[PDB]
């Protein structure tokens, strides 16, 4: 029964850049796999890393 008011199919569920799904490649800060580099561990992140110093 006719056709129109739609067509743009695509379905872009596969990033061109990283390959991984969920985002488009325009918005690809594809993961750089390192937890805390500042020490080396991957328990924590530099934005948190002061080792520890209480309140
Ligand atoms: Zn990507
Ligand atoms: Zn650290």
Distance CA 5, CA 34 (A): 46
Q: Can you tell me the distance from the alpha carbon of 1 to that of 46, in angstroms, rounded to the nearest whole number?
A: 59
Count other C-beta atoms under 10 Å from residue 43's C-beta: 9
- Smallest Cα–Cα separation from 29: which of 42, 38, 20, 40? 20
First CA to last CA distance, the chain: 69
CATH (domain of 18): 4.10.60.10
**Does residue 46 contact residue 37 with C-beta atoms inside 8 Å?**
yes
Tokens of 30: 């594809």
Spacing, Cα 28 to ligand 2 middle (Å): 25
Encode burial over 3-41: b for 16+ CB neighbours within 10 A, e otherwise.
Answer: eeeeeeeeeeeebeeeeeeebeeeeeeeeeeeeeeeeee
Name the experiment that determined this structure.
NMR
Domain of residue 38 covers 1-55
What's the structural domain count of the chain?
Answer: 1
> Which ligand places an atom closest to the C-alpha of 30?
1
CA distances from 28 to 37, 47, 52 (A): 21, 21, 33
- CA 52 / ligand 2 centre spacing (Å): 10
Closest ligand (CA of 49): 2
Could you give the 3-state DSSP secondary structure of residue 27?
helix
């Amino acid at each position: 029964m006719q056709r129109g008011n739609f067509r743009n199919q695509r379905k872009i569920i596969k990033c061109f850049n990283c390959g991984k799904e969920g985002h488009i490649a325009k918005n690809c800060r594809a993961p750089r796999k390192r937890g805390c580099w500042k020490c080396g561990k991957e328990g924590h992140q530099m934005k948190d890393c002061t080792e520890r110093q209480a309140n």
